[PDB]
Write a protein that binds this ligand. Structure first.
Ligand SMILES: Cc1oc(C(N)=O)cc1S(=O)(=O)Nc1ccc(Br)c(C#N)c1
Length: 167
């Protein structure tokens, strides 16, 4: 038994809730929150900017030190950093950004990073301002992640569309 509440069961291991991932992280303080990162860990907008804002920019400060030491991530890759006030850890995962010309096949590789963690709070990857179809992202998630994933979908009209079209 874990502390996630109000989620709809999608599979044996995938759950989905119409909620704001930041407000969810603040309430649950999960072991792992996933950030929809870019390879530079530049948290301007989307989930990244919202998570970073909720950390009072501490996420960005830590991220800049990480990049200065290690260089950029790979598209499809990840790194584990602090969760600051939101979670024990933040798993920064780089899903391909369609609008930037990044290959969509890399979405499966991105979701494979989730399998290194028993339980995660996560957004959908590669959707929103990353430019790919959210129904597709949910399908890849369900077909790739084997650990327990709690998906927070803030967009009300999208949440309903994802549930109603889920096979
Ligand atoms: C409001 C919304 O729209 C879509 C869509 N395909 O239009 C997804 C979402 S989300 O907020 O619920 N989760 C989410 C996940 C990842 C990213 Br990156 C963003 C952004 N930026 C948002």
């Amino acid at each position: 038994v874990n502390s996630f509440s109000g989620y709809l069961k999608l599979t044996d291991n995938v759950y989905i809730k119409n909620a704001d991932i930041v407000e969810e992280a603040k309430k649950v303080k999960p072991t792992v929150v996933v950030n929809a990162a870019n390879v530079y860990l530049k948290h301007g907008g989307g989930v990244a900017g919202a998570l970073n804002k909720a950390t009072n920019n501490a996420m960005q400060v830590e991220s800049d030190d990480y990049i200065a030491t290690n260089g950029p991530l790979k598209v499809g890759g990840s790194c584990v950093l602090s969760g600051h006030n939101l979670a024990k850890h933040c798993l920064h995962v780089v899903g391909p950004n369609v609008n930037k010309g990044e290959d969509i096949q890399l979405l499966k590789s991105a979701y494979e990073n989730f399998n290194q963690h028993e339980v995660l709070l996560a957004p959908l990857l590669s959707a929103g301002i990353f430019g790919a179809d959210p129904i597709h992202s949910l399908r890849v998630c369900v077909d790739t992640v084997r650990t327990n994933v709690y998906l927070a979908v803030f967009d009300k009209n999208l949440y309903d569309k994802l549930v109603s079209s889920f096979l």
